[PDB]
Symmetry: C4
Subunit: 31 residues, 4 copies
């Protein structure tokens, strides 16, 4: 489905947002 | 194809839940 | 595919592991 | 079906990356 496509794209996209939040927390605590 | 898509929706829901958890953690950390 | 099935199951499974790690961090910082 | 599966593998890889980030965060937090 192009339905699974779109959901797969959002999923990736939140996953990069989560990795960035964690990277940010890691940076901040390292200071 | 439908169990897969049902699965994707489920996966996205858990990401939202992880985002709520990170929202709380960020507040606790003074960030 | 029963291939997408298995990957979908592991994906969920790491997602519950991540939610539990974060829950744990949230608990610990709340103390 | 193959782009979806290629997608799943990608998604799992990002979860592993989030787990490495949480491993580091946990060490920083004294946990
Ligand atoms: Cl959805
Ligand atoms: Cl894989």
């Amino acid at each position: 489905m192009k339905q699974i496509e779109d959901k797969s794209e959002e999923i990736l996209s939140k996953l990069y947002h989560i990795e960035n939040e964690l990277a940010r927390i890691k940076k901040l605590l390292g200071e």
